[PDB]
Design a protein around this ligand. Structure first.
Ligand SMILES: [Fe+3]
Length: 202
DNA sequence: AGGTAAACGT
DNA sequence: AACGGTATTACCT
């Protein structure tokens, strides 16, 4: 048990990974990866894009979900069926049979790239979990608690691993340590992560 | 009266 | 290099 409400499902997406990676390439050929700039003016080391009906984005004013890619001025690409199917099966296996994501943020890590501890809290309906799928190079995941200083668990996430948090762990701090260089036959020299969220409704 | 943004030194 | 300060404020609404 990763924490109350939280599971790691090791190698859960390993058989779906080839198709997932083809579809990430397709998503990116419409809304390219870009390193976004925080409100305070720093360029993130992780490159990002989104698919689905809502996409996570930084603004001068803060963070937000938008139906429009602000770089292309066009809707984000539709969420691929391969993504939505894997998400629905991982959710179900982790105990969240009703999750309906309408947003998928896609992170790409080059060697050196990191994601500092943060909370996912931009979603209006905190009852829905987050589903996180890992592809390519391995990375160390930090998973804390409700307070930034709460002790961290560190876990290696390998190609195909899926983590799901929700309920009591929904607002826990988490992040990614600087990516080590290396080789993966499917991604060559990077790691991808797909994070599914329910970002609309109410 | 409340909610947000946060990505250098030891 | 793991931990924790910083937002301990200054803006919105
Ligand atoms: Fe996150």
């Amino acid at each position: 048990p990763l924490a109350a409400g939280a599971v790691i499902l090791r190698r859960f997406a390993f058989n779906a990974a080839e198709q997932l990676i083809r579809d990430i390439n397709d998503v990116a050929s419409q809304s390219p990866f870009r390193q976004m700039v925080t409100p305070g003016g720093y360029t993130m080391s992780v490159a990002m894009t989104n698919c689905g009906h809502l996409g996570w984005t930084t603004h001068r004013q803060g963070y937000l979900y938008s139906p429009i890619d602000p770089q292309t001025n066009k809707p984000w690409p539709a969420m691929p069926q391969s993504f939505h199917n894997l998400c629905q099966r991982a959710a179900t296996a982790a105990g969240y049979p009703d999750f309906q994501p309408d947003a998928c943020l896609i992170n790409r890590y080059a060697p050196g790239a990191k994601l500092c501890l943060h909370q996912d809290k931009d979603e209006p309906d905190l009852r829905a979990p987050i589903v996180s799928v890992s592809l390519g190079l391995p990375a160390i995941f930090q998973f804390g608690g409700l307070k930034r200083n709460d002790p961290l668990k560190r876990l290696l996430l390998e190609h195909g691993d899926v983590v799901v948090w929700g309920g009591e762990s929904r607002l826990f701090y988490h992040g990614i340590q600087p990516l080590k260089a290396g080789f993966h036959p499917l991604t060559i020299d990077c790691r991808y992560n797909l994070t599914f969220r329910q970002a609309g409704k109410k």
